[PDB]
Amino acid sequence: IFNSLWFSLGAFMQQGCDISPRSLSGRIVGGVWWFFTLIIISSYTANLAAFLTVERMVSPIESAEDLSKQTEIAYGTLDSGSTKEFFRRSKIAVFDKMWTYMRSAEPSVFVRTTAEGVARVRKSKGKYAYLLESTMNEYIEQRKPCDTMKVGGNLDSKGYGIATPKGSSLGTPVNLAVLKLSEQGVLDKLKNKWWYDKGECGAKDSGSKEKTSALSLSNVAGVFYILVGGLGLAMLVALIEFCYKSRA
């Protein structure tokens, strides 16, 4: 009720079975078992290989073109404003494809407010990207919970500029002041100020998420635990066996 059970335990431990004087009987079962465990471990390894491979194939988006190439992740802009009008007026094939898409996609990607769009991004768990003015995006990215981030370069050029009523004497000297503040770079000092020095998260925090690496301890460590636990069972059984060495 145990001895040849212990022998089978001596079988799985190594290839599978032996001792049997030429076939005899169940040694053929040893062969079938060998074939068996062979197949299963093969299939297992193949499967895990499938996980790591499919996992590696996936890539983060770094251009809207990536959105054009996919559909798993919904994307859009504010329901109104210049932004949508850009795509609507756009003649570039990528942006045109995107605009046609958003016009066609339902439920409509458009949202009433930028905040609502932020919520639709944060709650979609990466299934809904959003588009908006770059500086605004950077200003939000430093905001809590710091759960969202800008990616890629800017799709198009625009520039805020000081406005004056036309023909004002102030115009030219002010513009000169603009150029001076630009050349001095103090504006950038301000930019690192309000967008970061006031920021809810550090500028270098973005680099804290590592890169590729190669197999964390975690997954196998889950096997380390069952390993040490198996050792503990071995110890308990050992000492109780000494107790039977005394009792018997």
Partner: protein, 111 residues
């Protein structure tokens, strides 16, 4: 316009009065302009809060745009996008901050 970070109220703004009540990037920038062109000034907020647009009907500019065209405002310092339609009604300075359409997504935290 009242917009963070460019424009923010003091948390104790009631304690202050005038330009002190406001704070932000654009505010300090306004101080810079105050240095380079030497002037007293008062910050003012547009009522509608609109950046300003010319409705095709009345053909009346609203917002800060109207505030400039109608002489209500002396100068505009705000995240005001340059546009050709606004180009002919008022005189912009050279851009002080390149910017554009951008992709916001969830940050890919590992579990």
């Amino acid at each position: 316009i009242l917009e963070s970070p460019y424009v923010m109220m003091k948390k104790n703004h009631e304690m202050l009065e005038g330009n002190e009540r406001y704070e932000g990037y654009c505010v300090d920038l306004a101080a810079e302009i105050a240095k380079h062109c030497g002037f007293k000034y008062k910050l003012t907020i547009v009522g509608d809060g609109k950046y300003g647009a010319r409705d095709a009907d009345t053909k009346i500019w609203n917002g800060m745009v109207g505030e400039l065209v109608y002489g209500k405002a002396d100068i505009a310092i705000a995240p005001l996008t340059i546009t050709l339609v606004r180009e002919e009604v008022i005189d912009f300075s050279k851009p002080f901050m390149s910017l554009g359409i951008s992709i916001m997504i969830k940050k890919p935290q590992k579990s």
